[PDB]
Amino acid sequence: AKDVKFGADARALMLQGVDLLADAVAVTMGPKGRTVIIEQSWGSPKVTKDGVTVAKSIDLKDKYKNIGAKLIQDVANNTNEEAGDGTTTATVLARSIAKEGFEKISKGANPVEIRRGVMLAVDAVIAELKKQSKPVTTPEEIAQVATISANGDKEIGNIISDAMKKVGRKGVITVKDGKTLNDELEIIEGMKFDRGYISPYFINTSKGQKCEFQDAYVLLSEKKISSIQSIVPALEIANAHRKPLVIIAEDVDGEALSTLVLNRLKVGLQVVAVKAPGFGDNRKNQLKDMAIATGGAVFGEEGLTLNLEDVQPHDLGKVGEVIVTKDDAMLLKGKGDKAQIEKRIQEIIEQLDVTTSEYEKEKLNERLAKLSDGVAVLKVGGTSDVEVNEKKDRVTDALNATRAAVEEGIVLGGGCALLRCIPALDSLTPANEDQKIGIEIIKRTLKIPAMTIAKNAGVEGSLIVEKIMQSSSEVGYDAMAGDFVNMVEKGIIDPTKVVRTALLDAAGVASLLTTAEVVVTEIP
Amino acid sequence: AKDVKFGADARALMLQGVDLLADAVAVTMGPKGRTVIIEQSWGSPKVTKDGVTVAKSIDLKDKYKNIGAKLIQDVANNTNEEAGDGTTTATVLARSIAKEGFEKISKGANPVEIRRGVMLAVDAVIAELKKQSKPVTTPEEIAQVATISANGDKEIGNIISDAMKKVGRKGVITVKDGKTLNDELEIIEGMKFDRGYISPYFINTSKGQKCEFQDAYVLLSEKKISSIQSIVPALEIANAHRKPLVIIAEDVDGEALSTLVLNRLKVGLQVVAVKAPGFGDNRKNQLKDMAIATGGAVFGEEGLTLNLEDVQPHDLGKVGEVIVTKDDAMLLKGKGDKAQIEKRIQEIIEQLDVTTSEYEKEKLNERLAKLSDGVAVLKVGGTSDVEVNEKKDRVTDALNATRAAVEEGIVLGGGCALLRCIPALDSLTPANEDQKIGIEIIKRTLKIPAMTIAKNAGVEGSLIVEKIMQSSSEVGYDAMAGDFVNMVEKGIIDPTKVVRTALLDAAGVASLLTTAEVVVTEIP
Amino acid sequence: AKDVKFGADARALMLQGVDLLADAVAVTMGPKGRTVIIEQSWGSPKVTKDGVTVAKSIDLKDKYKNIGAKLIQDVANNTNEEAGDGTTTATVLARSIAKEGFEKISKGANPVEIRRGVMLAVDAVIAELKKQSKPVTTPEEIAQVATISANGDKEIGNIISDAMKKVGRKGVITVKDGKTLNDELEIIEGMKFDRGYISPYFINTSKGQKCEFQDAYVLLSEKKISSIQSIVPALEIANAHRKPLVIIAEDVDGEALSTLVLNRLKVGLQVVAVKAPGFGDNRKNQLKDMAIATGGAVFGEEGLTLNLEDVQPHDLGKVGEVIVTKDDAMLLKGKGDKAQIEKRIQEIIEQLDVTTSEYEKEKLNERLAKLSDGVAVLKVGGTSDVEVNEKKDRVTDALNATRAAVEEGIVLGGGCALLRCIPALDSLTPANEDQKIGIEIIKRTLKIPAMTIAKNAGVEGSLIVEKIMQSSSEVGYDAMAGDFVNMVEKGIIDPTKVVRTALLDAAGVASLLTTAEVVVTEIP
């Protein structure tokens, strides 16, 4: 069956669901957040203080309150960019916008004009943030930001800055467990292509739901899986030789997905299937470049007429470690970078020298970097594995924060980045009264992050937000210290990218919640 | 589904659960505790008077009262250090702290400042205990403490003191069943590595959930299990030869865990898998030392390129008895201590003579002790097995208490160790009023252990705790005698380690119960 | 789940359960007891007048009333010593003590002091009984007691006395079915070792849950079962030859228990596994003596290096009949008492002649008796099997009563043995008022046995117990006759051992019921 609710009733039930979820995730705001205890099916309760886990583990009995809580949890789950606290701010802002918009709609207003006003002013506050963003360009600035994001550690900051300097800013830096007493940095010959899992069941490591094979071959074909019969002979090589296979192809269809998943689930396979690197003639060029660097040969459609049905291990590319995420992939070491990598780099340089268009030239530059630059492996050391594992987690978080900072900038932390945009953007001209109402809604919501951090660190946040407003453009409120200390000098900063993405996602989900007119639920 | 409670409601339900569990375990306090009858599924009821079993066997229907009772039972279960009455004191202190903190929070106070005050004063009382600890250094003192901890027996005390003197203080002493009319002490060539079970289903002995094999080989490899195919050929040697195998490797992954557990559960295997001794280059050095002492050869990654896939019984190390706990492991006898142990001890001595760093030097000293010192086997005799078994249990308890005393010290027993710290630590300066409230909470809780022992031995404990406060620093209250007898002279002492650990664990769990703001429960 | 009750509530529910069970068993007191009809699943109701069956067949719906009724039934079941009416008296005394102690605790008193007073005076009444016990030493006295215990029969008394005289007092006397018109006594060469079943499923005879094999070999090994593979080849001999095997070893582990039980349950095995005779070097010496007498050879660990894995029927000891109880075992006839029994008896005599210690000397004497003395088989005859079976039961009961009398003594019957101890033990000095209360409780309970027999034989027992108190030390109350006849002269006597054991067990179980403070029950 299907129960259909209309307008105000559906909007109220969804708002109640998001209210519950947003409160449960609001308790995790600020550097002084309070823990939340979530039960586990087997074992002791899990004590967490991060909004992502809360949002993922908050279920609702009602199907409308649940349609709202998953509508807020969907945004929390789409944050697979390892963003730092970009799911708590988004959820709190979304709940505030949705609640106030619904309240004002109930008092009489056009749900579409409200959304127009909200989006105008969200765009005006994303321009203000881009204006206020302080760039992070020099190695000294990069080191300072890395130290700030590494919980104050100086070794972590120095080792992140050195890795970035040596392998290029926004370069391919990967943290790995090390067997030494102290951290060390090394550079090896590999490349990361932007294509991850095809199904979530390929994971081979609990940590980060990642999939790793220390030494294995890769199957490069430019034709997507069309029949299961294609896969069967290839896996026979993986069984015959000790080194398993890694499948990188144009695409994978449902039949291949089911076959691989079912075979892995019981027999215990160690082979993965991932989509090819990019699209267009450039997708084929990069696939051939990967085969050339790895010593392989494309087994898809070609004039040479080489097929993957007939297994030929004379040309099976061995890469060593191969780490593939739900969104990324990496071939760390290259076999054949002795004969096939010099010729191909020279060929790419020659094609660049005959550049005809910017787009093709840019893709050629990308290929050249992919092939020549390699990747920097960051080894973290310690006295014991548990200490090493904790340090690895910390350095990975610091690296992600530093990369986010390097891509855009660093704005005042503690929720003041948004709070500083209120007074500067009173110049907007809403078209109708309802657009002005939406602008007012957004103006009021920008305070909520700072209000929540202070309600989680201090006793009252209204006075704190008033003081921050009346203070100088560089003064905020250090929740840890409890004093209005210079925000940027004291090293309380958040990447511009995180705040921008959180603000945009909250606006989008709140627009969905405020515009939705009909909800179709399955009766239980 | 998931029902989410917030703040006071969740805190009250968890407090009720811990109240129930803490009462049931409070009835077991003092040397005059009262028995508690717990039903059994099959057979007669079990009559026990120890807090550990009570805590393990106390289940709650409510899921919030249960989230609190398992939160208190989790601390009781993490006591796998054979601690004596370090689970009853911890539970009672935790319940007192949680109840009073919740009551004062309800009257209005900041849950975080209360925790800060509690932790400041718990740290001040752990410093006071370390100050008041009387060392246990000389063999005469060790013998006196052993006699006190052996229920007053002098033979047990003498045999424990002799074993400690002969095999080094905090040395490797293991009690075993003996086939003689009286106790005897012998020293043999073995070593205990600090790595126990990988899953709880490897147990082979009901007593202490331990796993023993009188004579078996050990499989030493420096590469953790990567495929099940590795295990299969190794077990074939165990089947072919009468002596089974013992697997000590870098680590064991889920696939190997499942394979071994399922094969053992039905076929009746007698092989164990345990993690390697330590981490770093030292982990490999100690693994090679174990192989050299046992006559084996490391089958993990090496330049020699020796693998465990090809079974080679010419180099299978036979150890004799092998006893592995959930947290420990022991290779009691060594085959090849005739040719491979002299060379290796000389090599370790030479490397020590060329010591470059303290950490490496300390690890070299540890290896030297492991190899040369051996272990002392303590045999307990008696007229019949049941008498021998009871004496073995008693001597094991006395040995554990003596080792705890030798590691730190011996403070007044009967709950007066903590009670003596109240008057001496009124000098703390809490930062806010709430921190003073927390200090007062801790000041009041320190009495509760002595109050409970007297409520379990006498009629009222308030007057007893007042008298102990007003009496001299050496006078307490002997619950057995019912007179304020000199505590230390009358042999009522508790290890400093036990009181310290109980006090720290109670503070931690009470902090969890007082800070927890949200509880996520699965609806039934 | 687990529902936990505390103090008075749990004590009241358990007291109600024991009240029900103790009434149902109280109706079976005295020689004039009244029958109780208990339903059977299939067939006609069973009409019984013995407390043991009542107690075993009394189940309670409540889980607390049941925790008390099984707490009283546990003592009734632990009476596997074939004690005569030592389960009815124990139950009635336990109920009286528990009820009065609980009532006085409710009025305000320390449950521990009450127990101390109860135990002091129970010890004072066990000393008084040992003082009043009249010895049974001469053959005439033994015959008189046997006639009294055989329901007055003189043939039974004479045949029991003759067997005891010929095979030594407390000697190995076993009653067996005979194929003659009248009873006959014979002496054969066998020995009974004090080790019975390892699991209750080895029973092969409904009567007395005993297990018998008329002619079978015995497997003697000094190493307990370590693997199932050990058992398999041994049973193959039992299958090949018509005579089955009997397994006597150091011990049997769970795997062997399960294997043997499951194989027996379906295939219909006729082999038993029993623990070895005693412990220590004496356990091995007696096992070797058994092998030498039976013609066997120990197959456990030895310098000869003889194992039981290789079946060798040249040295399989044949014993003839082999009767093993849950607590006892017997090898009635010996093959090889022609060559291996003279040498071994001479060896034991020589070792005795070189006696060095009393304990070793006593064990040598025990071995000498075991080997030389043999056992006396008591054959009971009759016209038909049913008559023979009834006479066998009667003579077995008389023999057990006579042995109990010979071990300690014979005190006045009809419940006056305890009743005579009240006036003589008013001299105790309880330490506190509560200890005096406990002494009063015990003083009042000692009447309850005589009070119950008279309430089961006469109309009122208060006047009867008053008259017995005011009468002479030899006068009691014959319930059958209904006259205050000389108790000892009229042949109304009970063994001192039975009264002592009943009094001790009742005190212990009542102490458990009065001290228990917490009860943990599984919710249904």
Side-chain angles (χ1 to χ4, degrees), chain C residues 188-191 193 213-220 243-246 248 290-291 293-296 316-323 330-337:
Chain C
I188 63 177
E189 295 302 320
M191 45 163 292
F193 59 88
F213 311 104
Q214 184 173 3
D215 204 334
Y217 309 136
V218 164
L219 170 52
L220 302 175
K243 314 302 172 71
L245 273 173
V246 165
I248 282 157
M290 282 173 28
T294 315
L316 295 174
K318 187 190 289 181
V319 296
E321 286 189 346
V322 171
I323 323 300
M330 206 154 57
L331 292 182
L332 286 66
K333 213 61 180 181
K335 299 296 183 181
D337 58 358

Side-chain angles (χ1 to χ4, degrees), chain B residues 68 77 91 94 115 124 157 313 341 345 365 404 426 430 458 470:
Chain B
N77 300 356
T91 291
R115 174 165 64 82
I341 206 164
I345 188 164
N365 192 31
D426 60 2
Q470 301 162 31

Side-chain angles (χ1 to χ4, degrees), chain A residues 32-205:
Chain A
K32 224 177 194 181
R34 306 189 186 187
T35 189
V36 62
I37 303 148
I38 64 184
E39 191 206 69
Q40 295 285 263
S41 64
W42 174 250
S44 302
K46 186 192 296 188
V47 296
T48 67
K49 64 179 180 180
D50 45 358
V52 175
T53 312
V54 168
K56 283 213 196 182
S57 64
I58 303 301
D59 305 352
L60 292 177
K61 301 178 62 177
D62 289 345
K63 299 193 176 195
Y64 291 82
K65 288 186 177 164
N66 180 15
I67 196 66
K70 191 44 173 168
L71 258 193
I72 191 66
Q73 173 180 354
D74 289 344
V75 179
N77 300 356
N78 297 1
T79 307
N80 296 346
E81 306 298 346
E82 295 302 320
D85 206 41
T87 294
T88 299
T89 301
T91 291
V92 172
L93 281 166
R95 184 264 298 253
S96 167
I97 297 167
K99 189 180 72 169
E100 265 181 304
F102 162 76
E103 192 277 353
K104 299 296 183 181
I105 285 162
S106 181
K107 183 178 179 180
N110 174 27
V112 180
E113 296 300 316
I114 292 282
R115 174 165 64 82
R116 204 161 290 230
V118 175
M119 297 296 172
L120 283 170
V122 160
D123 275 329
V125 160
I126 296 280
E128 191 63 17
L129 284 177
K130 284 184 182 181
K131 191 187 298 297
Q132 290 189 16
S133 182
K134 301 176 251 298
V136 175
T137 67
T138 73
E140 201 274 358
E141 291 170 327
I142 294 165
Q144 186 173 355
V145 172
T147 58
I148 290 163
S149 298
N151 192 31
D153 273 308
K154 287 220 75 179
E155 318 96 354
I156 297 309
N158 296 0
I159 301 297
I160 293 319
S161 177
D162 285 351
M164 301 265 288
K165 172 183 69 182
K166 222 179 286 185
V167 63
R169 291 193 297 274
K170 199 204 195 191
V172 180
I173 299 174
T174 176
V175 194
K176 278 173 44 55
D177 61 356
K179 324 192 261 203
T180 60
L181 180 58
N182 56 344
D183 296 358
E184 65 202 347
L185 173 82
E186 65 187 306
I187 291 162
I188 63 177
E189 295 302 320
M191 45 163 292
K192 71 189 307 194
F193 59 88
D194 61 352
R195 285 300 194 287
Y197 297 143
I198 61 189
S199 83
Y201 306 138
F202 282 98
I203 60 177
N204 196 15
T205 299

Side-chain angles (χ1 to χ4, degrees), chain C residues 393-464:
Chain C
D393 200 59
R394 189 141 40 79
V395 67
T396 301
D397 183 18
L399 175 61
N400 283 340
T402 286
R403 269 202 266 166
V406 175
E407 284 193 6
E408 302 202 339
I410 50 184
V411 175
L412 277 54
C416 301
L418 301 166
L419 188 147
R420 282 277 165 269
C421 296
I422 290 179
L425 269 296
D426 60 1
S427 65
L428 271 192
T429 59
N432 289 337
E433 186 64 13
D434 293 349
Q435 283 185 41
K436 194 182 191 293
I437 292 301
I439 285 164
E440 291 303 331
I441 282 162
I442 191 66
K443 252 56 179 169
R444 252 173 292 168
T445 68
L446 297 188
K447 299 183 175 179
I448 297 286
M451 183 176 282
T452 55
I453 294 169
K455 175 171 182 297
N456 295 7
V459 306
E460 68 177 4
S462 194
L463 280 293
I464 309 314

